[PDB]
């Protein structure tokens, strides 16, 4: 079996083309936005994974839901969910059933009302932020790292895309995203402390903008992340104006730039993905690509993590970031770009 295989029965799509495969996950309730300027922060959830894979049928048979039992097939690391993937010959009714099962798993471990695609987008955002903040992937589960969790990312994306496409919500979110991009500069500092802020809308863009539109938008996203980092560094308690517009130590911007880098690297994984199909645009064509390309995606994710770890993480200055990011032909002088951008904010 060249592709994803169930660790219980050792079979995948070659011998079981219609059996749903799933990824063991561990999810916990967290604040959506730690910088939210409110004593009661809006709650969501953050998922991690060791990227251990089982059939939904095989897991449910061994249960005879009991996650103490499942941990033994999960390399002795904690799990409380089973994120389904949608194989090319798996019937949609079987996938949808297992996705409903996973949403029940998510409710039971997060005290959530209902897992929405918006909360799943925040989940991806929080996962990206764990890469970018160099926070532990294994402290709660006992095992897992950047390697296992980079491989989870395409499959959480697919669950967002599946719901976006089945409920016909993409065009609405395209308008929401354009609304964010059209916010005047007098709004940027406030957006830095909102739940649905630049980090959220960047992850939303990955789900609905094709690679060329990301190319035409990524520098403006970079501006939004740089201003967001400035406001959060100088006024962690919240602000509406940028009182301190002076360039700070690179630590002020480091995590936001790693966040940008990870998004850019995932777009690079999907660089040649068809941009429309019979059913819709990017949100549809990317979902179809993910269903059919487990192994090419596995290869591209390892390469993306290699670039992230070997090139972006050692970056120490904004000029070095632009070099590694391949942005120097679009941003001539890093020093002037950052200084002028921050001074431009009210
Ligand atoms: Zn199996």
Residue numbers in the entry: 4833 to 4896, 4902 to 5183
What did the study's authors say about this model?
UBR4 is a 574 kDa E3 ligase (E3) of the N-degron pathway with roles in neurodevelopment, age-associated muscular atrophy and cancer. Here we identify and characterize a distinct E3 module within human UBR4 consisting of a ‘hemiRING’ zinc finger, a helical-rich UBR zinc-finger interacting (UZI) subdomain, and an N-terminal region that can serve as an affinity factor for the E2 conjugating enzyme (E2). Via an allosteric mechanism, the UZI subdomain modestly activates the Ub-loaded E2 (E2∼Ub).
